[PDB]
Amino acid sequence: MPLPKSLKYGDTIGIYSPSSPVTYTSPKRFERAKSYLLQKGFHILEGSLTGRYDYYRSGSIQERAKELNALIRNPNVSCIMSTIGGMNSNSLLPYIDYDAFQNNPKIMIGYSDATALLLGIYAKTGIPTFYGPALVPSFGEFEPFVDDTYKYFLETLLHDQALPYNIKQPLFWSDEFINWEEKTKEKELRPNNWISVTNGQATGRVIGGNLNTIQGIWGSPYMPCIQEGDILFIEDSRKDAATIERSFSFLKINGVFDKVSGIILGKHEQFDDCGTNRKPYEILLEVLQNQRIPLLADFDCCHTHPMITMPIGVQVKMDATNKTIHILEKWKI
């Protein structure tokens, strides 16, 4: 299993916009995010669609594929990071140069709609990819939370790590919908807990990402096949109960819960419970119908702040009862 080199200070991070044109619509947060990473000691190479606008997207299918492929093919770029998600990353998949990526593995990181690319590249090349910060939402965040996200980013991509690698829970989180371009108040600190929904333990390859986005690639050559023993990692954001029930049942009818040994469920940013007062894991519990699968919920690798950086495609032990997550397998050189 071929691995990317670790990030180093002085490296260049290439950025691209596979879907929403955030570098046009949110210039202040974009500039703040660039400045944050420049100050830490990284260089930013702006992809060819930076600053461009095509309404709901940055550009045509062909132009977005060209933007990403230029970064993949550039030997001076060690990390490729989405600016933000959207809906439209899956349009790029037939056009990506997977051979160039496989010949010179790099860190590929982002979240939400970029799940289509993270999973497509892993499915095509076998190289682990990373569910973690996207430049504008993640590194344009104001203090305090941006500094916690950054610590997790260094831990996974830069620091030497000995195995197993314990992924530690943050003390505080927020999903507050505020302080996007300009800071008004402090976000409330929410004390953190992971939730032992269904006790138990599971060990196996972690596969997943943004669940809504997975339904845009399922069945294709870009979705890695779920195998007996895998651990399912899933998150969604700003949906309602009706939407996530449909997504949970989509997994159920596909036999996913017959295969996986365990489930890790992210927090759900600004969940709309439709008046039911049910939490997302409770809707998942209904769909599971008392099948006993260890389930650990409110994991901080999702749309809430701060964000953990998780390797996808490597062995993990999750312990739902004790609320721990360990990476058992090397993800980088």
Ligand X SMILES: Nc1ncnc2c1ncn2[C@@H]1O[C@H](COP(=O)(O)O)[C@@H](O)[C@H]1O
User: Which of the residues are catalytic?
Assistant: 112, 235, 303
- In the complex, least distance from residue 108 CB atom to its own copies, rounded to whole angstroms: 18
Beta pairing class for 295-299 and 195-198:
antiparallel
Residue 158 binding result from ligand X, its own copies, none, given CB thresholds of 5 to 8 Å by partner type: none
- In the complex, least distance from residue 302 CB atom to its own copies, rounded to whole angstroms: 20
Q: Which residue number, 84 or 320, has a Cβ lying nearer to ligand X?
A: 84
Using CB under 8 A as the binding rule, the residues of this chain from 17 to 76 that contact its own copies are 19, 54-57, 60-61
Does residue 303 have a known ligand-binding role? yes
The answer to whether 202 touches 307, Cβ cutoff 8 Å, is no
- In the complex, least distance from residue 256 CB atom to ligand X, rounded to whole angstroms: 22
Query: Pattern 90-129, binding to its own copies, x per CB under 8 A?
Result: xx-xx-----------------------------------
Q: Identify the residue whose tokens are 């590249």.
A: 121
Q: Which residue number, 77 or 263, has a Cβ lying nearer to its own copies?
A: 263
- In order of 125, 173, 258, 260, 289, the CA distances from 255 in angstroms are 25, 33, 5, 9, 13
Does residue 112 have a known ligand-binding role? yes
Q: Of the listed pieces 25-33, 88-96, 125-133, 300-308, which binds its own copies according to CB under 8 A?
A: 88-96
Which residues in this chain contact ligand X in the complex, by CB under 6 A? 20, 84-86, 112-113, 137, 177, 180, 237-238, 269, 303
Does residue 58 have a known ligand-binding role? no
Residue 60 binding result from its own copies, ligand X, none, given CB thresholds of 5 to 8 Å by partner type: its own copies
Does residue 275 have a known ligand-binding role? no
The 3-state secondary structure of the chain, one letter per residue: CCCCCCCCCCCEEEEECCCCCHHHHCHHHHHHHHHHHHHHCCEEEECCCCCCCECCECCCHHHHHHHHHHHHCCCCEEEEEECCCCCCHHHHHHHCCHHHHHHCCCEEEECHHHHHHHHHHHHHHCCCEEECCCHHHHHCCCCCHHHHHHHHHHHHHCCCCCCCEECCCCCEEECCCCCCCCCCCCCCCEECCCEEEECCEEEEEEEEEEHHHHHHHCCCCCCCCCCCCCEEEEECECCEHHHHHHHHHHHHHCCHHHHCCEEEEECCECCECCCCCCCHHHHHHHHHCCCCCCEEEEECCCCCECCCCEEECCEEEEECCCCEEEECCCCCC
- In the complex, least distance from residue 215 CB atom to its own copies, rounded to whole angstroms: 5
- In the complex, least distance from residue 191 CB atom to its own copies, rounded to whole angstroms: 29
The answer to whether 86 touches 114, Cβ cutoff 8 Å, is no
290 lies in the site for its own copies, by CB under 8 A: no
- In the complex, least distance from residue 84 CB atom to ligand X, rounded to whole angstroms: 4
Task: Among 160, 289, 292, 333, indicate the residue that binds its own copies (CB under 8 A).
Answer: 289
Q: Which residue number, 173 or 257, has a Cβ lying nearer to its own copies?
A: 257
Q: Which residue number, 249 or 324, has a Cβ lying nearer to its own copies?
A: 249
Task: Among 43, 52, 238, 252, indicate the residue that binds its own copies (CB under 8 A).
Answer: 252
Task: Among 87, 161, 238, 329, indicate the residue that binds its own copies (CB under 8 A).
Answer: 87
Handedness of CA 204, 207, 212, 214 (dihedral sign): negative
Annotated binding site for AMP: 85, 112, 180, 269, 303
| Binding site residues, its own copies, CB under 8 A | 19, 54-57, 60-61, 86-88, 90-91, 93-94, 215-222, 240-243, 245-247, 249-250, 252-255, 274-276, 286-287, 289
